[model samples]
Target: MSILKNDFLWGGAVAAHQLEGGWDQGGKGVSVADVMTAGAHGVPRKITAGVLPDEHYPNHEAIDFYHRYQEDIQLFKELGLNCFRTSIAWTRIFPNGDEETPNEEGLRFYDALFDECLKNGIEPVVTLSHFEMPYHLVTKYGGFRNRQVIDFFVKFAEVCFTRYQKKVKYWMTFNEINNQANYEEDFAPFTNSGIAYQEGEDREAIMYQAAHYELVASARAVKIGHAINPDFQIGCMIAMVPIYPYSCNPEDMMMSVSAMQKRYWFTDVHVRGHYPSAIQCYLKRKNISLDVTEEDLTDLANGCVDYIGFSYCMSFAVKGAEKGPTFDYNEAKDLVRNPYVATSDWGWQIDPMGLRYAMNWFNDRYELPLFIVENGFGAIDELEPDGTINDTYRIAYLREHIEMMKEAVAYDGIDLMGYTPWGFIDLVSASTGEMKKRYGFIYVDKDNDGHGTLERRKKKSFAWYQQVIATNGEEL
Candidate 1:
């Protein structure tokens, strides 16, 4: 038997901005997620200047997880989950992100939530900062682009590490920290760095500078977390979409490698503790001067993460572009569809084997242990007159991914820590802010327009995943 079967982590993942509503409850201040309007697959979500009363903000009332956490944890217990992964809203703890003292009521809410998970034998894995940053930070400090935000982030991490030292064992510094690699995209940059770009103001250069600060902040947080609790296992979270060549041409393969370097250098710094040559070369060729210092380099080397946690939903195929000194930030022009795989209703590629390939790829690149913090299928579902949801398609998608995970462990001999499917319960989609693109074993009665009974029900995949966890991957 593989070592993974001995003590594997079987669980599900959700982000606070995507699931936990109560945007104002518990004295929590507004976050960046609160000001964003919802959009569909091809449409772009607009980032409003502030919380306007007239506009509809999807995350403001997301699934109401704050009030119904106990009920949700009960469902997770029923599914036989050994762990549960969710993020902490920075606003909930600090309210304004620059506060010296943390909010007691907000801290107490997570206390109760983690207690419920512990009561059900579900180990809580906490992510410190997800996509939602305190909106006040953006307005006051210009987000992470300004070095002041790093101090605010480190303070937030320190407060959480001190408060939840015993309840939460697994910690992730940031959620999908590398999504900003698509620096050309306004949404990814705004979500990842809270940077609202000016017209033609060197967006790529600003992204590099902002990402450097964040990486430094992450290293400092990891160091502080370990000092607070030596037993803490702190990791960096990345979004992994393995890039493939469009054809067998050498140029195509080289382009794919370059794409990987640009997209995945965040992990290189997180695991290896220093910037790779590709990043330095890219920065130099672009003439982007970042504020990297000797002390920051020392901190990064000293604070290498304990593991690499990532989300793998799909893979992309890219073709070579025209030769230039600087790499192109926009990917749409170079990105070609993989002919072998199918796509989701939301147009995300469905590649079960890509999960296995991702595992092997990470293992070969870094010797650190890997935790698949997010993997699942998001699709449209139907509810019958009797409240029955026949979601066998979701089941098949997850089962194939799990089977590949098992093979990666048993055959490839990779050091895997866990498998947590995204959205164990229906929550607001981060990309589109739509509830219709569901990826949950438990279904919440909500729609794209945000009207529902807010009742939860079990789907076919609910029992299917329950059995898989009960057998510890044997049943799958």
Candidate 2:
């Protein structure tokens, strides 16, 4: 028997901003979260420097998971989850980014959260910071643009690491650390614009500078986490969108290689603990220089992550197309379709083989356990008049991925750690930020108009997933 079969880490994943409403409950203050839009299909809400008191957004109410977590966790336990992943809102921890002290309430909610997970036999994998950061920190401290944000972030990490170090086993420092790199249109709202949006700053130069700070902060957090407890599995998280060239054209191939290499930059620093020469060369030619100090270098080398966790959205990757740095959803239409692949409404190519490839790729590169922390197909589903939702599409999507994952473990010689599908229960879409593009086995009843009963229904995939995990992929 292979080691992967010893146990399968099958569960659903959600973020605080994406779910868990009650943005201001339990002494939780307003955050960049308050400004986010609450729709589906990856649509993010927009907020300027100043807030108009009269303005209202959808995420403010979310699915009310904040108040309903007791009910939600019960459902997760019923679903046969061996583990789950989530994040702590930075603003919730410290109402303002620079506070010298952390709030007890923020830590307490997670305390109860992990307690529930442990009771249910689900290991909690906590990410210290996802996409959501306090708006005040960005407005006042220039998000990650200013190097000073490093200290502020370290403080937040200290709060969580010290508090939950015992309860949680797997730790990820950042969620989609390369989200800004994907730069998916309105679908993926990027919070880490870094210094690009800083007042009167050169957007490109500022972005590189801001990236430097996040890298430093991530490395510092990893170091602190190990110091606090060496048993903790601390790693940096990123979105893995591997690019393929359109054709045999040399320029196209070169573009694809460069884009793929860019994805590696995030992992290289975390695993090998240094910036590769290719990244440095690219930065120099672009006239973007990072502020590096001996202390920063030392921490990065010493704080190398123990593992690598990432998300795989689609199998298709583009070369040099109509979009320069950004991916063109329309041009993606022309890419050759894989016969075995299935695509979602938004046209994300769902290739199960991609998951197997991803496992092998990560193993070959970093030689560490790879976790498929996020993977799912988002689609529009209609609630039947009978109150049962038949989401066979989602079933088909996930089943194939699960089969491929098993193959990777059984045949590919990779130490597969776990599998946590995104949005076990439907919440807002991370891409379009809408509920329409649903990914959950548990269906959330709410529309863009925000008028449903806010109730949960078990989609067909719910029972399907339960069995998949129960058999440890044997049934699949």
Candidate 3:
């Protein structure tokens, strides 16, 4: 018999900006996600200065979920979801993110949303600040570059904690907080911490500083949350892409280890409440001077997370580095294709066993409860004649991943909390902003060019996943 818990959080995950439209509704201001223009696969999303008059912002009316959430929640209920993960738009509550008073209308909106979920017997798992923060904070405060944003964020978090303490029990501080690990890129840093770099600046150093402040804010939120409600389960989220050695060479293995260390440094601080030695040594070697005070150390220690929530979509392979920093994402030392795994349309390698490997890796290191908050296959879905969308590839992908999860729990005794696949219903893609790169059991009527009647249809995997949830992994 499978040892999966009966109360496992089998549901879908979506972000507010990716799914909920109505960017101007209910006293909402602009967010980082709002200014990003839609792009397809292999194309980059442009970050505009602000909302232009004639610009087409994909997230502005994404699926119109803001107006149509009741219908969507009913669909989630039909899929037998026990929980649903979504984010609270910071701009909804604090239009500029530094306001003394929150927008009551925004508070009322989530209150109603949470009420709808509870009315259907679905748990609400909320992320405080997913990639989108108030855009005004970025323009005025230079984002997380200034430590004052920490106070602003904590204020936002505190309001949410106090308002929704009874309704929301599961809380995560940030969504994929470690994405800034690719400090060389402006996208990850800007999205993760609102870090916009200048010319001739040490981008990596600034990223570290921004990350430090965000960490402090996350810790402070955790501390404040527990005080407000003792039952609140606050966790930290990370994007976990396990680094592998391309060959059995000793040099390759060493490089892979170093890569993994750099990638996991964020989680180490969140779970263990301190920076790892490898990161400490790297900072010193690079002559990076951070404003780390004794008080900050105390906050990190006191606000350790209750569990670790992470997303594992793919893994990377690295070769031996003969030159500078083996962890650079763009450089040759960064990542290589693993020929063993099949590739998605977007070139994300599909590795089912990698999920099991990641479970064990996190288990050995943190010993904390692990939740697979996001995992799925993003593919181009073909809507056939007679309204039949056969997504058997997606079914196979999820089944294999779930089987490995079962083994990790039943055979390996890894402590896992739940598994919620990313975007159980098709939503806008975070990377390319395309509707074609869909990851959903329930298909929404929409396209990359923003054409469709905004209807919902069930794919073949819908019934398959319903059975999986109904039988609790036995059917799989």
Candidate 4:
């Protein structure tokens, strides 16, 4: 059976931007997110343009994961994780993304983080930059739109690759390449393009171009890693939400295919290391040509990822019809009709079957390993008076998804690597910026009000997950 075994990376995921506070701690500089709002849904936190002296920005000092990492790592160890997936904040490592030398304080922070993981028998998987870039690069170089951003990024990757080669076995070059221009709401506002839409500024085109540079830089890292040690496993991380149309109409079906292709563009380049002809056709249709240098092509050819990793959010599958114009209704309407599925409060359709589908598709297409890197439901929860959070719903949600993966492997013969649910403990929300949409098995006492005890307690799912990992997914 190709099911997850003893060596599976049973862990939870967190990002440095979302969890680590201490915006300027350990010699870190003010990142783009540093001055941003402590945003939330109800009683939304605001970060106004004018930084009044009296205004208290919440995200500037988040859950204090930067200062409290030891306690957090101990919590993760208590949960029995075999791997730890967290990002190295670009600002922390290199206060400015463009740096000839890495700061020792920043390097020491990771040296300690990884050492703790290794001591606990947990492997560390690091992402170079996870949506939190140094503000200097964006202000000076005009973000990824400028070609110079490529050189700066390559420098960042080279520094980390050369420094932490022995500590981190798994390295992901970029996080969610499509999220920037395609879906701005998924992250924050400091990342705003800031420029008015001029004649040459096609948002989609610019995003893909940025992705092109990142692809080349990622390939360079892969080539470097291979030479350093063939045993290192390097991959690219993406945020994937497979889209399906509302009906079987031909136009709707084609739209569904188009959406899938849009998501697959990055994967195709990562797994196969070339711009697929269909992508070229799409670029030509838009009349935007990419200036691909010979060196870039060489990097692309050599820097193909060894494995593919992505997050699954509220699984979706669409149907299309032949006669109607293109439209999508998978976001809402008649979700209750599916008896076996459960949608989140926000109308996100839950489909454990979609995880199996994703695994099958990736495995069939690439013949390479697949990692269910991130998946979990987010919801509001209330702690009982006794300080206990009995989050049985989360346990039920993950249990069913794990069962689906088991079926995909044991019955369908797909090679699955591991599962790392997003936000091991509570962190900032990707969409709404609300802590109320709590996804963590360990609860943090901080609330949307920016005041709390900052204590950590295991929810019901915490113990449930421990058994799942200890038995290698057999507990289900």
Question: Tens digit of lDDT per residue, candidate 2, span 282-346?
Answer: 77877677889999899889888888888877776554655454332232233455456567778
TM-score of 1: 0.98
Cα deviation of 459 in candidate 4 (Å)?
A: 0.7
Compose the digit string of candidate 1's lDDT tens values, residues 18-137: 999999998899898998999999998889998988887999999999989988888899999999999989999999898889999999999999999999999999999898898998
Q: Quantify all predictions' global Cα lDDT against the true fold.
A: 0.89, 0.76, 0.90, 0.74
Q: What does the lDDT come to for candidate 1?
A: 0.89
Weakest 10 consecutive residues of candidate 4 by summed lDDT: 328-337
Model 2, position 49: C-alpha lDDT score: 45
The lDDT, on a scale of 0 to 1, for candidate 2 is 0.76
Tens digits of lDDT, candidate 4, 1-476:
32665567888888887888887788886665654565544444443443357765555666888888888889988899989898888888788777778788998898888998899878899887676777777667766667787777777777777777888888788776555535322242234321112354455556666677777777887887778778888887767666655557666667667666766777888889788887677778767688789888888998899888877776555555432443322222311233446778855678877877777777777887777778988888789999889898888888988998898888888777788999879987655555678899999998866778889998988989999887888877
TM-score of each: 0.98, 0.92, 0.98, 0.90
lDDT of 3 by residue, 1-476 (tens): 55698778888899999999999899999999999888877688888898988777889989888999999999999999989999999999998898889999999999999999999989999999898899999999999999899999999999999999999999999889888888776688889999877899999889889888989999999999999998999999989888889899787888888878777799888998899998898889888989999989999989999999999898888888573454433322468899899989898999999999899999989899999999999998898988889999999999999999999998888888888999888999898888889999989999988999989999999999999999988897
RMSD of model 2 against the true structure: 3.2
CA displacement after TM-score superposition, residue 162 of candidate 4 (Å): 1.9
Candidates sorted by lDDT, descending order? 3, 1, 2, 4
Deviation from native of the Cα of residue 138 in model 2, angstroms:
0.8
